[PDB]
């Protein structure tokens, strides 16, 4: 009875940025699930395609835990069929996404007085992302007709932009840690206590 290391991804000391989201393949274990849903410390717990209670008695071929950090007003973009700077250039969920989107406020951790500018997010990109695509390219983006010879300037902007996280920010502009569980469904390797 080896439970899945959900404490290693949810409580993770340092979280990766949304443009370079961290995926941890979870396999060969039993998912408690009910322990995560019982905790009231999460501000958003939306599931798609599968009921959270039925997952406690079901099995899947593989599960993936995608963890990153965004802002409050951007959590609504972590959902199937969403548009925005996060859903198009950073983390795109499929229109047939089968899983759960979990998010909670982390203003007392990732925010520092004077500003914590270590979390980044892609601001420019010539085409929207594919579902579950990950872009870490630091290539200078060409906005206008002028060629961009790898030097920043007018219509020559660095694609990544830093977040401004201060404890004095509004409730909708604070750092929120998001964990997305993708249920890839071959023999099943992750089951619930029911089975």
């Amino acid at each position, epitope marked *: 009875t080896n439970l899945c290391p959900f404490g290693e991804v949810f409580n993770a000391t340092r979280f990766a940025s949304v443009y370079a989201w961290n995926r941890k393949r979870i396999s060969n274990c039993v998912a408690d699930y009910s322990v995560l849903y019982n905790s009231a410390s999460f501000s958003t717990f939306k599931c798609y395609g599968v009921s959270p209670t039925k997952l406690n008695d079901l099995c899947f071929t593989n599960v993936y835990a995608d963890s990153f950090v965004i802002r409050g007003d951007e959590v609504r973009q972590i959902a199937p069929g969403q548009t925005g700077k996060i859903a198009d250039y950073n983390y795109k969920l499929p229109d047939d996404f089968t899983g759960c989107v979990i998010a909670w406020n982390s203003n007392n951790l990732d925010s520092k007085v004077g500003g914590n*500018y270590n979390y980044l997010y892609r601001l*420019f990109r010539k085409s929207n992302l594919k579902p579950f695509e990950r872009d870490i390219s630091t290539e200078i983006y060409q906005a206008g007709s002028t060629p961009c010879n790898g030097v920043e300037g*007018f*219509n020559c902007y*660095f694609p990544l932009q830093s*977040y401004g996280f201060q404890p004095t*920010n509004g409730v909708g502009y604070q750092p929120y840690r998001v964990v997305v569980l993708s249920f890839e469904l071959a023999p099943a390797t992750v089951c619930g206590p029911g089975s």
Partner: antibody, heavy 119, light 107 residues
Framework: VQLQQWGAGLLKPSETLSLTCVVY????????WTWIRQSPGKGLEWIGE???????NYNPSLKSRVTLSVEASKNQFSLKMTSVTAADTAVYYC??????????????WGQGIPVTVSL | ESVLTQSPVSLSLSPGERATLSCRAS??????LAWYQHRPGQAPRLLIY???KRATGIPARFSGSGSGTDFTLTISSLEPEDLAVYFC????????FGGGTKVEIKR
């Protein structure tokens, strides 16, 4: 989203222009904040833009006299001009540069503060 | 540098009529055009961006069209609050603001 603005309105033809502009209800993240001015009947002239990371783009005409700045702590950014002549008398707007479909436009315009330059 | 010209310079149209403002470009720009509205005693706003996309909170009367060098801004129904000066801008290589067209209301 609103923009507050400070700055002196009367300078000598040999002093230094100084204008600050603070942003409220919005972090200065995904924006390229710029200064745009318009002398009476002259037409709009793009002074220069700056971001949170400090990258600065300037107009080739006044690139020598303009020294922008940015204070991410107070959510403010300033504009300083050296040796302001009488031709610099204009209404100075502090404008935010949105990123709409990979094209940087100017959605949050400001009211503006005129700077009369005379002895 | 590309220059922007607007036709006409002043428009006198009664409320309820359709005003079509043109902004011609000296060089090829494509869809890198935008229309701004400057109320008489207020700060300017962004009405149309990318030559056809209506900005947030802008009434449906304002509609942009055109691509390449000839763009048209069409106000479907002039309302008494639409009395302002409208100017265009391009971002194809360098920022060049248009001359501007004044919209006058007849009564």
């Amino acid at each position: 989203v609103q923009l507050q603005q400070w700055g002196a309105g009367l300078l000598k033809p040999s002093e230094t222009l100084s204008l600050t502009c603070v942003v409220y209800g919005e972090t200065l993240s995904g924006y390229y904040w710029t200064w745009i001015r318009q002398s009476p009947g002259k037409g709009l002239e793009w002074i220069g833009e700056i971001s949170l990371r400090g990258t600065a783009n300037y107009n080739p005409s006044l690139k020598s006299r303009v020294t922008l700045s940015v204070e991410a702590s107070k959510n403010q950014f300033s504009l300083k001009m050296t040796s302001v002549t009488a031709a610099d008398t204009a209404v100075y707007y502090c404008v935010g540069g949105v990123v709409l479909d990979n094209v940087v436009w100017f959605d949050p315009w400001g009211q503006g503060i005129p700077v009369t330059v005379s002895l | 540098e590309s220059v922007l010209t607007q036709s006409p310079v002043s428009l006198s149209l009664s409320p309820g009529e359709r005003a079509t403002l043109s902004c011609r470009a000296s060089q090829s720009v494509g869809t890198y055009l935008a229309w701004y509205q400057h109320r008489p005693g207020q700060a300017p706003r962004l009405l149309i961006y990318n030559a056809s996309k209506r900005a947030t909170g802008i009434p449906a009367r304002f509609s942009g069209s055109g691509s390449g060098t000839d763009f048209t801004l069409t106000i479907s129904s002039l309302e008494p609050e639409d009395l302002a000066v409208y100017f265009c801008q391009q971002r194809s290589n360098w920022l060049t603001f248009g001359g501007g067209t004044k919209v006058e209301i007849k009564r």
